[model samples]
Target: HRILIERQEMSGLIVGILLVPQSIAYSLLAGQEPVYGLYTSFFASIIYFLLGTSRHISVGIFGVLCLMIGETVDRELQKAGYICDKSCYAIMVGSTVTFIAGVYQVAMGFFQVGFVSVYLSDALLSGFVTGASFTILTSQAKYLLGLNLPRTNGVGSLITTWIHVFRNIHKTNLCDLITSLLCLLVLLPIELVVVVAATLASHFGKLHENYNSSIAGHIPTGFMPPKVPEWNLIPSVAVDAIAISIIGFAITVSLSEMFAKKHGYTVKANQEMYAIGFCNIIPSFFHCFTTSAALAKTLVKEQLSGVVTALVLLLVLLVIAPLFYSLQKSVLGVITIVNLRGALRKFRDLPKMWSISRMDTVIWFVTMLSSALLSTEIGLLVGVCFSIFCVILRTQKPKSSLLGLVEESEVFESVSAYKNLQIKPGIKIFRFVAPLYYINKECFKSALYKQTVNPILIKVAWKKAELHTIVIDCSAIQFLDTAGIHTLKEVRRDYEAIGIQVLLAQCNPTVRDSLTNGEYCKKEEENLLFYSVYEAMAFAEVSKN
Candidate 1:
């Protein structure tokens, strides 16, 4: 508990510094008011602390999502011809997205669809995030360099922004540049100092011992992180609130739970989802950005030993939000540079991702660039394309290997597993690794046809003996669509008519549901749906008819 508290405090402090500037800058990047960033940050920490799984996950506002929200608002404003009223509409759009995400997260948790994270491959996430970070830094380059470029849409806009920045280089201010550089230099060392010092104190078991030491500075902290909104109406921010909430739910319920399990923690994903959802939901009543699990904030929280130090940050943001407008733009500029340096640092992952997963890296890079170039909503559509491409590349043409029955216990073992086991002659078991999707449905039929024909021919031509039963082990089958289910029924009917009983073994409920709901199961064949190959044999013994 001490370690947890210390980690929370330290994490909050570091993330607070980062969020203070990034939140403001990203709000500007998104074409919204700078205060939106603070709105996102202050509420995120306080609420996330109440419901998020980790103390280290520093929940706050982020750049890419903000950009998306901003572009969406702008598009809607143009459609409505509310050009002058764009900012207000932009805030409304962002709140709408966050509200949607939060409610969706809670609903998903209740429904137990927490495995959605599995769809996000490591390669795809890495590449997309790297590209996103690059896009963040590049889009902000104009501000840091003080460039004047017209707001445009898509990839063309980014190129134009850079072109304009270069064309107007002579008009750039030396003061802003110098301040930005200085802020970057100073912030890195200080942030690292705080992180390292706190880590060392915790490592040696001396944080509590030295809690009263002269080294302990006035960092803010709290147990619950002080709720941002009270027990009031949260229904108003319903639309855009769901966006951030969904992103947070996806990040926390999926990623956080997996990490916790890997490290032997009993953290429940479903529960975590509800926690994060309610965290954001509660704050929406106060008109704050819907909170989500913050990766950077969480990282800081872990380092600080799981302390609830978000109150420190809440106080800082509240103070700065109202007072910082009068400060020198150069100071704000410095803060912006310091805040965005991390966004630039993420670019280092690009070359590595390109080297390891070139296609996905390219996809993410393009999506990121497109997102910066176009609108955030469009960028998501492009990024999702990566997921589809990766899936197709793997399952467009699935390979099926014939398995040999090793024994009553290890029947339908893979051909590769035959090295250590004996095979029963005249019995062929085919293991379909992937489900019968539309793309692979024909492939499955062709593969099964070839296997079934070869075994039956051996019995007829070579006098090997009659083949008894054919079992298709579907333990690995993830899911099946309507087309796949139709094809499956056809295969079962044809095989069963040819004096060969087609048995499905160890099918998952999702696949089973699709097949059953599609009316593939004959009215009299309900008992044949077996959880294992052994169960199929037991019923076969009683059904001598």
Candidate 2:
């Protein structure tokens, strides 16, 4: 136990070293004061460490979620107008959105809707995040090029950013541009070193007074007391709050599940949601913005420990917060842009998804496009809705096939695909490959009837041969709604009127019970529900003889 403690302590120290620069840099990405990033890492890390089940997940200001919060805060402030105090108003919007979003996360966990993560899907999420990465990349271009552009949202933002850059090509600040470039050159934790070097250069070289370029002039030290963000702010930013909650939850749960799978443990997704809920709400009072699990930082924990990251940032908050007052905004922009290299890399997944499932490929493309062309929340909303629409569309036109018996075996296979199998005369075996839902019930009936009439096309029987008994292979029809049950009964009645006996084979217990309860088939006609297609075929053949 002592050895374990020693190892944890050692790991914590290593991870702490990595957290200092990231917490501050990510804060800039989040559009909050750099000090707020440290507050987020400090408060959220401690809260999540206590409430979370996964040991490796590091909760802080993630890039995508930060961009979302930044955008939301900006829009709210803009809408409020010049009369509102900018700093106080931005924090109110940021913290209120965070608090509301956290409430949503906790509610989801309590309701056990963690399984909703399945719908987000890996392909769709990658595309959405990639598109968002491009938005972030473009948003930072102003800082990189030292070109001042008015903040815009959605597709308009990307278009205007480029326009502003081209329009102001000659107005770029040389010193600020060089600082951003130098930071990119050193790219590691030396990011912090660049800030220090730039600050010293500005102070000793008196660059700030001469260059007409901006630096982080006054970052307040120490922590602010917890205060409730105004609840009235919820109405205007409600949609963004929900979007932030879902996206943040989705990202956190994905990372938690990934790490849990690798480390051989079970992840309680509900607990994870609850953990992040507190991580957001508790810290918002202390002036932190929306927080979520970061994959890059979590990976650092995989190598070291969360305690170290948390402790390191906490210590930095005390000692190093004031030192960054002179940090160049452009250099911080460089850090944000460089960090997104990983997210930008996800575009490569599109070609790979295209080969695997074209529908998934469409999902990826649509998600990416929507995110880039719309606001981040709208992008996620569009992708999720489109994904669900695809599901419904697929199910609405499910595959229906006629089954043929493989010679000398009881096995039944799709007649169209298996040429070696042959259909028995006087027995029409039809199978619907999905549930008997209302949307597909008519199609199911139409296909079954067509196969009975034109068996030659399906290779089930000769076109002229009479179908004495129609046996439905219900092995794949795991469920039946009221409309489906009614449809099945109507089909059976119509066939019986035409001197054909309709039978159901391989009915799962739920469907069989449904048939009995619906009075589609009675217990007196027990032979109507055969155990398998082979049994139904043998009975049908005997009846025919």
Candidate 3:
């Protein structure tokens, strides 16, 4: 049995207090009533506890996922001209998308596709999320300042929103302004020490007749009735569903792995995917939007277990759910803005990447700018596209180098890299740094010919000399395609026609097999292949003698 005085219990008590404000705040962010955020907290946590791979994770409505779900809701409602109010239709659309995302995730888990997460590199993900955070901040600015700005999408919306806010600055509500400042202060140090006290003050202070500010108003007391996911709308949201599922899985796996490493435990990625899939599906039935594990909440739970935290939430759900009726919307808005402060710091990663790799830095900037200028879904697609393009660009031209032996050592290195290394008379050792492919095969042949005819070598030689044997080092080439094999055959024939011998050395099994089985070599020239450059040199030395 667990002891009452344990750290987990105490930690749980602290998180329970923290979750009250967080649940209400993030729910408002998700474009749902505050009650639904609490619903998500209750249902998602329990489901994840049962099926999840880690005790440290807290399943709940996340900011970014909620923003995507909200956009989906807005688009669907707009398509129908808002004839159907968003309260009912948004739930249906959100739930259907959640179900689709769940189905996709479960399929991925069963197929052992956990490795697919690698495609979303950390730099690109951070950049996209940071861009989305600015979008969120812009969306909530109207709430904080009590402005009625029209909803806009795309890159320039932030500046437009700010302009609208300032143009109508005279209409700013002092009450909301006051509430936002107070809530912003709640994020600073010493405020958290008495955060519950501050929340209680804000809750009850607005209930008095003297209060003139806006509050969350009435919230329903009981749980929502279970409803079937609307399957008809699934096709409409298919793009969103796929994007949401992949992003949620990537975030969950990344955070889970981080905690597991810190605590000296192993996390099963596929099992985590299964758990998240169910977490979203089960909660969708109860009016919850698509949900995922948030790193902040999970970090809290990592220090404090879930049992007491859930109990505290359940207590608040039963008793004081009505107490928050007086909580101001502006306060929730500030809470969201403050939480995203960490995401905004993602901008710092650009300079870091610039120091490490300029290509990665460019990827981060493009992802960030695209997400800011376009829709989140479009921005993510662009980032993935640019990332793939970067991969292809890197392999378009492989590094080709001339190799020479260092003193009496058998080790060979790039001749330019080791200036003291001596080249054998009449022998050219050439190394290709990557796999030979259709894209780079021609470049490889051109580099080979240039290395053999270097003007510096001719000028510095002890006497006028002619090149004899050319040994192509194939140790670095792991594979070769049809075009690569044909190019190699052409290179060998060209050199042979010019009275120079061409041989391959240290070829791996796959490359060796492709050449050996091939019609690339003539009947007698098959013996030109050698297991090592030294062996090829020995044969060339014998031929000269």
Candidate 4:
């Protein structure tokens, strides 16, 4: 235990060191005062430490959450505005959104609907995040290139931002261009809070008043006085609050659950819901922006040393807050861009995804385009909707296989997958290995015909020579609903009219109840039920003779 804790201490310190600069940088992404990002880092980690079930999930200013939160904050305030007449309305709107989202989370957590994240598939998530990273890269290009183009809000916002950039390219300032170039060039493959000291040191020189990078930081020491969320603004932000709440919850829970799986421990999803709810809820009073589990932070944070990381953020909040106040914000831009090295590599997944599953590849592409070109929330919605359709479509067109007898064995296996299996003398064994219901009943009918000759077309063809009997292997069929039964009876009646017998075998208790209660085997069809494919095959062989 002591050795384990010692390693955790070491890792926690390294993780905290990483979190400090990233926290400040992510704040810029969210459009909240950079200091609030500092507050977000501190409060989120501490609360998660106290309440979260998973140990390694580092809580704080996640980039995607920040970017999304910033999008909402900027849009709402555009109707009002930030930095105008020194107004504090950004804090007001930001806190209100967080509070409303917190309420949504805590209320849903109470209902234990932690399973809400199930709709987001692995491929969809990968594309969504990759697309999000691309958007973040596009947004930060402004800081890197020293463009002070106005922030554009709502749909197609990135398109407008870039159009404005092209129009202003003739005026691109080189101060930050060179600043970013060297930052990216020197530390493109590196880590650490190096940018903090080096950029601060490089800028202290009396270079000039004109060639200077525009604007900078000034994080206040300690907390802003606790204030209530702007209740009057709730009516306007309610819809955005739902997206904000659901997206952060999906992000945080998905991350920790993945971590929990890799390490062989388990995380209870419901507790995480409550923990994150309070993480957002209580912090709103302190002027903190919304926070959640960060993909990079959690990847880097891997031990009990997370306490040390939080402590480090605490130290920054208490004393180190104002030290980087004059450091150009462009350095923050580069640090996060460098963090994207791994996420951007997700593009490599396409070749692998395409070879493995075309459906998932299409999902990934649609998700990426929607998020990257349009915006994140829309991208997320599109990916999930597309994925759900893919799922239902798959169920609707489920595979149905023909079965053959393995030599000298009672077992039956698929005809196409085996080399030595025998197709029985006068029977076709049909197996549909999916839940049978209204969705695929028609497919079931066609698939049965695919394996056997239709008795109505008995032209004495070679294929029809041994097609006297058909046995449906029904163990794989679950849920035989009313529509499924109606379809099943019509199929049996049609085959019966042409003198072909249909037998049911291996149907589990529920499906048997479904057929039995429907009076499906009233009298003439009473000998048709069998316990196994072999039983049905033996009965069909004798009945045919």
Candidate 5:
């Protein structure tokens, strides 16, 4: 319909405006020409348009991903000691890094492992991005302060940059600093166009000449034929490329899912991975740095980023690209800082995060600290391992509960959280919340005895009441592995030697099938398992009488 077309046209154009400045700034952040950002935006949009599942996503240049590319390119360039056409060499090397990373992304898509983004947990992402935001601040501060801290790279680069900035504090340029400050204020409101205005002012006012402020300098206009990557520079960055691809996919898919939920649509993870990879690969040939969905811009217009937006970006690249030659780097830095406000504001989330889950709070803190203190990849690696460690640490020592009937009702509840609950004489009810597996087999056995007979002290007394039946409330046990099934059988056999009975109650089909296939009990003794604890209790009472 015309209505749909008109709305799509209007919204896409609106985001196109926001996208331009961001693409330029993030391109600068990635240590590439401002033109590369526009290239990335335009190319990313077209590829994602054809491939992405979510209509809500705006696939383009993202700040953190750009920061990552910037750090990597600078490190590789500095180490190689390349001279002449620094920007040209840098684009080749950097885009090559993106190409490798895109290959990794596509590999993951083929393997259908996109769901592994869960490892980037909310706690991990929050802390990592927040830490990354600090690094972004440190990276951008050079422009904001108008200091010439040579583009930093490697492990201690973040700290080194800050140290250099602090050491040279007095050397800050007032002109550049003032423009940075004022731009930060105006940018808080919103700027691909504001950048044009600043460039115009800088040109007329001669900020570049009189104040000696660094500007964008020169941006080549129009489109150039796509070029192939240099083969010589590809070998050293294989590992780093893998890291970039993962976070790139994670951030894009996560943002896509958020908007998908908000707008009531579905997103296919594997397709997303494919689209994101192609987005990166296609644009790399066009001299663009790594690209992902822009969170701030996606959130801004809440509009679908498509051909219209790409067309708008193309228009800017052709006609408006030359207009930004006088734009100050500090203005770009200012834009980056204000955009970081949302991520930086996560410091306030700590108190609430602690109250919610101390484990996650610790996860958030350590993830943030490591990310801020180290590289994003290292921080992410640490967080993933730590969070996985916590999951195992938690599973191995979970405090399970005993269940008791509530006032003759068929339903049973955890005794610890209920009042005046009753347990029939010689009938012990147990509840194991987490799934039973090899890692937690002993944990289940330990909690089983302790909760059933209250451990050593009551064990003999429990045996004294003949026809003792310990019914495992299997309502929560979704499934059991071989070790778990064997663990239960051994417990039942060992306990039965003392003239007690073990009954399994309320297992769903999957759990029941495993137990039955496990030969946990003789098929002849079908009564050993019951539909519910109520049925088990009645049978146990009848046997006792």
Candidate 6:
């Protein structure tokens, strides 16, 4: 504990400073009181320190909900004919949303729905988050420069606000505009200085530790004893809040788990959901809006001294709260712009993204554009759909190529490493790496027929099982959609007509369930044989003999 405490002291303090500013700024971005950000800073740090699985993703306030909350609250207040001065009501609304988000997190934890993030790919998330950054920047544009905008939700309102800005350009506050522009300009350089300084510090620390061997890598251990009973905001929920709580929980937990995993930590989405739910649940009483992991702040936390990360934050909270009175909204706007600019700059890495997959590139851009121009939730939906669409497009035309062999004598130097396996015209082998489903049923068949040239043998090696002899390897497959089942039946029928035997190999649990559940295996069965890949291959040869 002593060693750990020592290690966490410096890191924690650095992270605390970073978190303090980010939490305060982001809370404003969410249209909540800056104090709520302070509270989140106090609670999320302690909570994540206690139970979080990821070393990174130091939980605080960050996500799509925060953006929407600000926009929605602003619009609702206007509809009520309320003046902007009444931020108390807006803060109340944010608390409601946060509370709801916590309840949702708890439910998700209980249901163990964290794995849902897996369905959220890099391209989709990248697009969604980048758009989120841009949206935050755009949404705050009016306030940043003190322009007037119509109270509306989503992109249409954003557009309306921009139109109003142009229409009333003459009415813009010159001071606000000048401050905002100046803030934006300095934003990048400030970040660059911080990053470079942090990098140097971290590098020197590493060097010192390597030689001196006294410095240990660890953060102080403490989950500030849960003060749930002391919190005052938990009981604020009505029925509507409860309903929204479910959705909010899902979003926070899922987002946290996704980012957690991306940083190389194995995160249990459900556990995170539970932790966040309970964490925010306690803070709700204190009137903290729903808080989740702040990506930027967490990154800051990671590199700063980890020794007293939470303690550092607690101390900062004490120090920063009184100063909140002196804090200007425009400065908060500047921080928001800086945070977002970093994410949008991901466009520069477009080539790296494309190198992974062209379809992914398309999904990335589409999701980014959608997220920026539309609501975060809507943009998320579009990005996910696009991700699934890209996958379907690929599987609809699943590519199965013959495993060709090049001998060592080939011109390429690495040819020495090539296996000298020859193509036996009498046997054709096919391998499938992607999912099989209804969308690509016909396409799968075309590729199968086109590739199986010799005494055709379809050998499917999926994750769990190797299929041989026109074998449908079910082991690697999780489950077959309706189209996949239909395609299987057709393959069996066509092979029977060609006097070729059809076999089923290594049928994984899910794939076998789909086939048997559909009765396809029994009804449309050709020489339907099921065995391990090795067994199936052996059996096929014997049957041929």
Which candidate achieves the best TM-score against the true structure? 4
Q: How do the candidates rank by TM-score, highest first?
A: 4, 3, 2, 5, 6, 1
- The true-versus-predicted C-alpha distance at residue 269 of model 4, in Å, is 2.5
Error of 5 at 289 (Å): 1.6
Candidate 4 structure, TM-score to reference: 0.89
Q: Which stretches of candidate 6 lie over 4 Å from their true place?
A: 1-24, 46-57, 75-85, 181-271, 303-328, 401-437, 448-545
Output the better candidate (3/6) by lDDT: 3
> Each model's C-alpha lDDT?
0.57, 0.76, 0.75, 0.77, 0.79, 0.59
Which 10 consecutive positions of candidate 4 have the poorest summed lDDT?
1-10
Q: Residue 506: error of model 2 in Å?
A: 1.1
lDDT of 4 at 27: 73
Error of 2 at 222 (Å): 3.2
lDDT of 6 by residue, 1-545 (tens): 00111112255655666655566567766766565666666666676666666455566676555676666566556655553257656666665656666766676668766455556666676787788787677666766766656555656555666777688778655555554565567665354344334334434554233221111221222223432332243354343344344434444555555666777657666666677687677776565666665656655654113336667656645553443333334555666777776677898989997897788889888988887777666777788777877766776665455443345532211112335555433444445556777666666667667766322343232223522346444554556788888878777766665466676766666786688887776774444545454455455767666
Tens digit per residue, CA lDDT, model 5, 380-419? 8999999999988887776588888878467788888888
**Stretch of 10 with least lDDT, candidate 2:** 1-10
Worst 10-residue lDDT window for candidate 3 reads: 1-10
For residues 1-545, write the lDDT of model 3, one tens digit per residue.
11122123257766666677776666665666667777777777778766778657776777788888878877877876653366767767888888888888888989997788898888788878888888889888877876677876545766777888888888666676776676677665232444454457766665334343445553555655688887888789988899999999999988888778888577888889999989888788887787787866665555236667667777777886665566556766776677778788766665777999998889988998888767888889899999999987776777888898878778888987778888868888899887888888767877876878633344446256578888889999888899888888777766666667888888786786798777666565555777787877777777766
Q: Model 3, 445: alpha-carbon shift in Å?
A: 2.8
Alpha-carbon runs more than 4 Å astray in model 1: 1-18, 48-53, 76-127, 154-157, 184-242, 254-275, 278-287, 301-374, 384-393, 402-433, 436-438, 445-545
Q: Against the hidden reference, what TM-scores do the models get?
A: 0.61, 0.87, 0.88, 0.89, 0.85, 0.66
Instruction: Rate residue 337 of model 3 by lDDT.
Output: 78
lDDT of 4 by residue, 281-329 (tens): 9998888878777887676654356667778777777776666556665
- The TM-score measured for candidate 1 stands at 0.61
Candidate 4 Cα outliers beyond 4 Å, as residue runs: 1-13, 80-87, 189-193, 214-219, 264-266, 354-358, 455-466, 523-525
The prediction achieving the highest lDDT against the true structure is 5
Worst 10 residues of 5 by lDDT: 1-10
Model 3 clashing residue pairs (backbone): 155-373
User: Candidate 5 deviates by what RMSD?
Assistant: 8.5
